[PDB]
């Protein structure tokens, strides 16, 4: 709406930089990784990496370099942001307190200047005299690294060469000397300049080389003893110094464009090189002291590397933007030099499309061989340790068969009319017999009871068994030999139900004595003592109510009617944080949780939750010193309590029918889980985290739609193929060439487009349909149309030819996925590109070139044009709400149309032209529209006299710092609405609406928090969030930074009071009063619950 709250659900995962050095101490080897707005600091260890500190910056990191000035005990870090915020940082540690301190800072943007074609380059000379920055054409900015230069004051030196490709400071020179590749009308060349420190000007460099390779792009400064520079191009690698010149053009690099490098050893004898496709090379400088030759070796394949950094022990960090980052080992005489992957680090970026399943996020992630689906869900994972093939389990119980051990050593399992016993000795499970227990009756309960005894309650009877001599000592049966229907038991009490009748027995040495009997249907029972329980929870069939009876009197203390026809399945009395509760699960998956008094026995407050569609089974288990409840159903849930309030977390597992805690020698503080075919032994994760499943496709996913009725996803993908000599061939197997079934519509690279059908449970590629040659699949929908009950996958295409700029042909193809195959139901030829499509009130709305067209789906199964709106812009973006349609182009031209049912046509309602690159757009509500625009901004426009009605008003501007590819309405977990976004860096965010009152409070709170939060590099939050382009800056408006608001929870108590001191809190009446720290704490904690939490980086 007009007031929006934006918050990060998943921090950026793509790596844009990586450096090593001695930052945390002189003795540590660190690995520093830049992930856009975040800096990760690791200590390199023999095992791998130890995370020590992660920080966020109010900026996009564009330069990240470690350096050591004279006099400094350890390295300092230089950072330059995309908004030209420069800083020098120092790591400070005292015990467990870690602070990143700003030694120096300043903004180095020039009032005028043309940002260079090859971007921002920041370099530091070997002697640490200066930072050299190439920000603009014709200028070289020098920041002297003098102790007193705390404002990073700089001077510019004119560069006659206006088209510089790359630049480095050389080693082994008497004065700071730059070496650069540049292009001019006479070709591509290499040159050097000395920096006169006294004059603050360039002097002639020691050497130059005109007419280097046409594609020379990378400069590498070689250290002493040799010095000089290595220049890498498309087909050649050259070495240059004052007189020396070496050149190689090996066949091993013919198919490569080398775009990243890293030095392996301090003397520069070896360099790692990465191309655009995952090949990793070692460049070796051969000596005879003197430098005699260059040699390249292909090491193998890594993720497509944005950046590389050698660590130690033959281990290399591969920072990836297009796929997962990695740790690889260069093993690398008997064999050639080669690399092996050791570790993988999740990267969701680029997120090019995404969809939500249920009410999980599924993204189209990566590109090329790194292309994948990522299935994301929040929840509590289970580390599985063991699996046993034992079908039909109807119940699970832990047991300690040894009275001199506190740990469980037995798992008792029930089956229909049967009971089995498993003994545990370490991780060795062996089925045995239990003397005293019957194996021919289904067990309803069994376990350790008072007086060193065991109990087994079956349909037939209640059996008491001694521990030392395993034998039956006392048995209870119904007076007329009737079967027990429901059973409940604790250490000293047994409450059994025989249809409508109820019987209360007590456990004594070698005896089970029947105390009470009352006729009530009985559906469920419970006697958990909150060790003799004075109360008894019960569930009934006729009234469908949960009642709390007394013991041993059986007098009704409370009767809570649930209503409906579903009978209750499970009842439980449990305590969370000293507060007593009574949970009750129904036969439809509903959980009615009520407060309970151990003395009075009444329902304090009643609330209802939905924990699945299958009936829920409740089981107590202990985590830490607290008590939790495991809810078994189709969606297993762990019920717990935070601040005396119940929290229901998802378990990261499919259907769990039964569970029991298990604390054995081999499986301490574990659990046993059972589904219809398997018994699993596992350990629950301490806390909630995002669980991500990766589905590699080895080709580019582009668009995704979920088809619930078919239990699958439709994915548009493309793979690159090359012109083969024996005429195209694929470069590797991928999802579109490895599908279970396939269909077709009928050395340069070609793109082959496909529609993949992917199973939602196994993620198998069930089908791949290949589009026509030169056909580009652009848009995808899954929907029902008209009166046809079938759900279809619909694809919009363009025919693409290099000789034609504008698409003149394309089609809309309607597919049906039935049985295991994709059938083409219908197609419609259009005379242009089908950029977008949306299902619109049972019709198909499509944007073709500059037109918006509405199609009706007829009983003859054909698309028939109803109406067509000619726009003066390309209808690139298409979003709808009701009868309203939002149209957008790449240049941020926004158009609002309304379909008129009585006219069978569109009417233009409003429009706005404000030229800028626009990457995505979304409808927030009937009057507000959200977009993403250059550079890394969000905007909101609103519809407000004909001229006034047709005018979209700018109501929101915010510099997000990420590039949005997709917006989608969705719930993953004051505020109103939920719009999720996926970005190039793999960051996922949420936009939600606020009332004006909440916006005013949070805006005021931001201003106050900005005075207390320490900013890394001393960048102002307002400057960071200001709407930004290269030419202009405007303060943010109509957006609250949720990430900043949440940081309020991590500041000291005095600082919280300082932040809220002049805040006016409104508790819903307009009568504003001074806000307290406790008021804002609960408001901000509530705000944190609207999105997935962020994992702690360090141990």
């Amino acid at each position: 709406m007009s007031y929006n709250y934006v918050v990060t659900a998943q921090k950026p995962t793509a790596v844009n930089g990586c450096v090593t050095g001695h930052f945390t101490s002189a003795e540590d080897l660190n690995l520093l990784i830049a992930k856009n707005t975040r800096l990760e600091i690791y200590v390199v260890t023999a095992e791998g990496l130890r995370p020590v500190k992660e920080v966020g910056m109010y900026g996009k990191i564009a330069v990240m370099e470690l350096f050591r000035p004279k006099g400094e005990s350890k390295d300092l870090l230089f950072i330059l942001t995309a908004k030209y915020n420069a800083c020098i940082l120092e790591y400070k540690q005292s015990g467990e307190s870690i602070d990143i301190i700003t030694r120096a800072h300043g903004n180095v943007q020039d009032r005028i200047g043309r940002p260079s074609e090859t971007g921002i380059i920041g370099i530091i000379d070997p002697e640490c005299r200066m930072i050299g920055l190439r920000l603009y054409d014709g200028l070289f900015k020098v920041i002297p690294l003098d102790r007193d230069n705390k404002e990073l004051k700089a001077f510019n030196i004119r560069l006659e060469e206006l088209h510089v490709i790359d630049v480095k400071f050389l080693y082994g020179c008497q004065a700071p000397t730059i070496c650069f590749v540049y292009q001019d009308p006479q070709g591509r060349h290499v040159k050097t300049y000395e920096v006169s420190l006294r004059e603050k000007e360039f002097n002639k460099g020691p050497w130059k080389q005109e007419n280097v390779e046409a594609e020379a792009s990378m400069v590498i400064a070689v250290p002493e003893p040799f010095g000089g520079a290595i220049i890498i191009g498309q087909e050649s690698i050259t070495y240059h110094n004052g007189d020396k010149y070496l050149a190689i053009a090996p066949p091993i690099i013919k198919q490569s464009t080398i775009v990243c490098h890293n030095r392996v050893d301090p003397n520069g004898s070896r360099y790692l090189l990465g191309d655009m496709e995952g090949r990793l090379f070692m460049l070796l400088l051969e000596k005879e002291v003197t430098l005699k030759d260059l040699r390249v070796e292909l090491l193998g394949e890594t993720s497509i590397a944005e950046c590389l950094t050698y660590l130690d022990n033959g281990v290399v960090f591969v920072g990836s933007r297009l796929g997962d980052s990695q740790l690889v080992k260069l093993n690398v005489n008997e064999q050639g030099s080669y690399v092996v992957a050791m570790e993988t680090f999740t990267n969701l970026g680029p997120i090019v499309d995404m969809c939500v399943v249920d009410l999980q996020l599924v993204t189209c992630s990566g590109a090329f061989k790194e292309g994948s689906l990522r299935i994301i869900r929040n929840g509590i994972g289970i580390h599985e340790h063991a699996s046993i093939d034992l079908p039909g389990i109807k119940g699970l119980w832990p047991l300690r068969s040894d009275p001199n051990r506190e740990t469980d050593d037995t798992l008792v399992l029930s089956f229909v009319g049967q009971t089995r016993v498993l003994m545990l000795n370490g991780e060795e499970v062996e089925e045995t017999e239990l003397m005293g227990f019957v194996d021919d009756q289904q067990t309803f309960f069994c376990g350790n009871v008072a007086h060193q005894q065991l109990i087994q309650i079956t349909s037939a009877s209640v059996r008491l068994v001694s521990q030392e001599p395993k034998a039956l000592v006392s048995e209870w049966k119904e007076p007329q030999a009737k079967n027990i229907s429901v059973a409940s038991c604790n250490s000293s009490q047994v409450v059994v139900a025989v249809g409508r009748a109820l019987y209360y027995l007590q456990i004594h040495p070698q005896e089970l004595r029947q105390i009470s009997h009352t006729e009530m249907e009985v559906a469920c029972l419970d006697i958990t003592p909150l060790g003799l329980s004075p109360l008894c929870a019960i569930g009934l069939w006729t009234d469908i109510s949960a009642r709390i009876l007394k013991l041993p009197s059986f007098e009704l203390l409370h009767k809570e009617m649930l209503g409906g026809e579903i009978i209750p399945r499970s009842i439980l009395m449990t305590t969370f944080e000293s507060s007593h509760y009574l949970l009750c699960a129904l036969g439809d998956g509903a959980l009615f949780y009520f407060g309970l008094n151990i003395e009075t026995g009444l329902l304090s407050d009643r609330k209802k939750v939905t924990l699945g569609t299958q009936p829920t089974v409740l089981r107590t288990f202990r985590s830490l010193s607290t008590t939790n409840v495991f809810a078994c159903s189709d969606r297993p849930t762990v019920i717990y309590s935070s601040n005396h309030k119940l929290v229901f977390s998802n378990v990261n597992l499919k259907e769990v029918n039964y569970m029991c805690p298990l604390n054995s020698d081999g499986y301490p503080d574990s659990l046993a889980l059972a589904n219809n075919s398997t018994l699993t032994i596992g350990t629950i994760d301490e806390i909630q985290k995002l669980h991500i499943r990766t589905v590699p496709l080895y080709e580019s996913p582009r668009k995704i739609c979920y088809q619930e009725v078919s239990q699958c996803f439709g994915v548009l993908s493309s793979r690159i193929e090359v012109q083969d000599t024996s005429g195209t061939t694929a470069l590797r197997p991928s999802a579109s060439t490895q599908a279970l079934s396939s269909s077709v519509s009928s050395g340069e690279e070609v793109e082959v487009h496909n529609l993949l059908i992917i199973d939602q449970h196994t993620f198998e590629v069930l089908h791949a349909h290949q589009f026509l040659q030169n056909e580009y699949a652009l848009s995808l929908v899954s929907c029902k149309l008209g009166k046809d009950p079938n759900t279809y996958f619909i694809v919009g295409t363009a025919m693409v030819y290099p000789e034609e700029a504008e698409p003149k042909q394309g089609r809309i193809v309607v597919f049906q996925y039935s049985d295991g195959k994709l059938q083409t139901v219908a197609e419609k030829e259009v005379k242009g590109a089908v950029y977008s499509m949306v299902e619109f009130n049972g019709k198909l709305l499509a944007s073709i070139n500059s037109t918006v067209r509405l199609y009706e789906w007829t009983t003859e199964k054909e698309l028939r044009t109803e109406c067509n709106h000619y726009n003066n812009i390309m209808a690139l973006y298409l979003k709808t709400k009701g009868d309203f349609i939002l149209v957008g182009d790449l240049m941020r031209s926004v158009l609002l149309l309304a379909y008129k049912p009585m006219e069978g046509n569109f009417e233009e309602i409003a429009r706005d032209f404000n030229p800028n690159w626009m990457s995505a757009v979304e409808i927030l509500d009937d009057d507000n529209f959200l977009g993403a625009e250059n550079a890394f901004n969000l905007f909101v426009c609103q519809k407000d006299t004909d001229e006034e009605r047709q005018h979209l008003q700018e109501v929101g501007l915010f510099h997000l710092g990420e590039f949005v590819n997709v917006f989608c309405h969705g719930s993953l977990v004051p505020t109103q609405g939920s719009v999720l976004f996926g970005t190039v860096n793999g960051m996922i965010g949420l936009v939600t609406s606020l009332s004006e009152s909440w916006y005013n409070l949070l805006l005021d709170m931001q201003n106050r928090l900005n005075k207390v939060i320490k900013s890394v590099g001393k960048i102002e939050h307002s400057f960071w969030r200001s709407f930004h382009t290269e030419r202009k800056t405007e303060p943010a408006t109509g957006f609250i930074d949720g990430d900043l608001i949440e940081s309020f929870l991590d500041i000291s108590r005095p600082k919280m009071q300082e932040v809220v001191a002049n805040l006016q809190y409104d508790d819903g009446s307009g009568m504003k009063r001074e806000a307290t720290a406790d008021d804002l704490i609960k408001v901000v904690e509530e705000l944190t619950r609207i999105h997935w939490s962020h994992p702690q980086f360090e141990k």
Partner: protein, 378 residues
């Protein structure tokens, strides 16, 4: 082929007479700033930035206004009239005087000026004073965009963004593949980004400018190129006011390319359906392009499009070289044979060795660009 005709002659406006005093100072007003600028009362033309406008002023209030203007910033406002009769305009362009000459022979004061379009503006209000109007205007910024890839560009590929110089169909295929490689990080393909790429759009336009002018000398900045092209397109006032409203060079180029591709027929505006000439007959007799503004002896400005051949016109009067905008040619009034509307003139060479021996100069205000069997497209 143009033989024995100096194509540099039309832009010099030699018909205005002896050498004029030149002014080299440049006044530019801040973006979005509000300014009060005088309007010349009889000026009716829609000025494009960078476009020359010759004027001849005979009224003492126009003469004193221009004399005072020369002393100051030398800038006046040219309104793009929506309704010329009611004198209402929502947009316009400033014009900066760069050449001036005053004639006082026989006691008759005349001021001749050459001005150039500078900045676009929105009319906030129009107030009439000495008879000269003063427009309160808001300066409209020129929207300069980076490359579409500049935000999404992977830093490892920044070093590959300078390509070897253009020598070719294969060069442009390689240009698209390399410049838009990071399209694979976004929702769209490289061929879509090419449709919004300044260099690509300017190259596509240059192919059609070669068809008009066989004998490059064109701006490298897309802003200047888009304005140079805008001033050449023979489009009606409704289309031109829409083109003047565009603030981006990319949208301006896209729009010009779309008109050039669609509007291949030029009809009589009054008639609507009478064809006068086609896109195939357009040529550049002036180095500025196929169409330029010229001023007649009474001070009226005509944007005159030069075509090799025109049809359905009747010739009234006898050829005259008096005040001819094309030295060496005589003009004769040409009227539409159907409605008698004055469309322009037939120009005939006064010397046998000249080429072309004849051409037509058609006035922009009399033509209607037609798509043979017009939605402005941004």
């Amino acid at each position: 082929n143009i033989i024995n005709f100096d194509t540099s002659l039309p832009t010099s406006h030699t018909y205005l007479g002896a050498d004029m005093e030149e002014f080299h100072g440049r006044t530019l007003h801040d973006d979005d700033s509000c300014q009060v600028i005088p309007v010349l009362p009889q000026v009716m033309m829609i000025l494009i930035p960078g476009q020359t406008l010759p004027l001849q002023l005979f009224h003492p209030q126009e003469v004193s206004m221009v004399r005072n203007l020369i002393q100051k910033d030398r800038t006046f406002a040219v309104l793009a009239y929506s309704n010329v009769q009611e004198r209402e305009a929502q947009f316009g362009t400033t014009a900066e005087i760069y050449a001036y000459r005053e004639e006082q022979d026989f006691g008759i004061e005349i001021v001749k000026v050459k001005a150039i379009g500078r900045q676009r503006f929105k009319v906030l209000e129009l107030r009439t004073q000495d008879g000269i109007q003063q427009a309160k205007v808001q300066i409209l910024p020129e929207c300069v965009l980076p490359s579409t890839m500049s935000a999404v560009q992977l830093e490892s590929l920044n070093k590959c963004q300078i390509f070897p110089s253009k020598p070719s169909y294969k060069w442009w295929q390689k240009y698209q593949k390399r410049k838009f490689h990071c399209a694979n990080l976004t929702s769209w393909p490289r061929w879509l980004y090419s449709l919004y790429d300044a260099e690509t759009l300017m190259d596509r336009i240059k192919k059609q400018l070669r068809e008009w002018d066989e004998n490059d000398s064109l701006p490298s900045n897309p802003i200047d190129f888009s304005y140079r092209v805008a001033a050449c397109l023979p489009i009606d006032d409704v289309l031109r006011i829409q083109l003047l409203k565009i603030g981006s060079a990319i949208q301006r180029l896209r729009c010009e390319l779309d008109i050039m591709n669609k509007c291949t027929s030029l009809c009589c505006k009054q008639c609507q359906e009478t064809e006068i000439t086609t896109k195939n007959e357009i040529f550049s007799l002036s180095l500025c392009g196929p169409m330029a503004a010229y001023v007649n002896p009474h001070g009226y400005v005509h944007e005159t499009l030069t075509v090799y051949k025109a049809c359905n016109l009747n010739l009234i009067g006898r050829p005259s070289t008096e005040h001819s905008w094309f030295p060496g040619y005589a003009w004769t009034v040409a009227q539409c044979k159907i409605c008698a509307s004055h469309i322009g003139w037939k120009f005939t060479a006064t010397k046998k060795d000249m080429s072309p021996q004849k051409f037509w100069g058609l006035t922009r205000s009399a033509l209607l660009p037609t798509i043979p069997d017009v939605i402005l497209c941004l």
